[PDB]
Amino acid sequence: FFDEKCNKLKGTCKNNCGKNEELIALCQKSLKCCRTIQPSGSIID
């Protein structure tokens, strides 16, 4: 449910977070929902 909503927020479940990506939710199979955050501005918060 948590990163199911992350899926809606277009967060991809990967092992290690990539470019400007942060860990927002813990998935199964050791995947983590990482959001590709937009730079230049104050992230997403």
UniProtKB/Swiss-Prot annotation:
Coiled coil: none annotated. GO terms for cellular component: membrane; microvesicle; nucleus. The keyword Ligase does not apply. The keyword Membrane applies. Keywords: Antibiotic, Antimicrobial, Defensin, Disulfide bond, Membrane, Secreted, Signal. Disulfide bonds join C6-C33, C13-C27, C17-C34. GO terms for biological process: antifungal innate immune response; defense response to Gram-negative bacterium; defense response to Gram-positive bacterium; innate immune response. One of its GO terms (molecular function) is heparin binding. Expressed specifically in epididymis and lung. It is found in: Secreted; Membrane. Its main location: secreted. Belongs to the beta-defensin family. Has antibacterial activity. Acts as a ligand for C-C chemokine receptor CCR2. Monomer. Interacts with CCR2 (via extracellular N-terminal region); this interaction may preferentially require specific tyrosine sulfation on CCR2. This is Beta-defensin 106. It comes from Homo sapiens (Human).
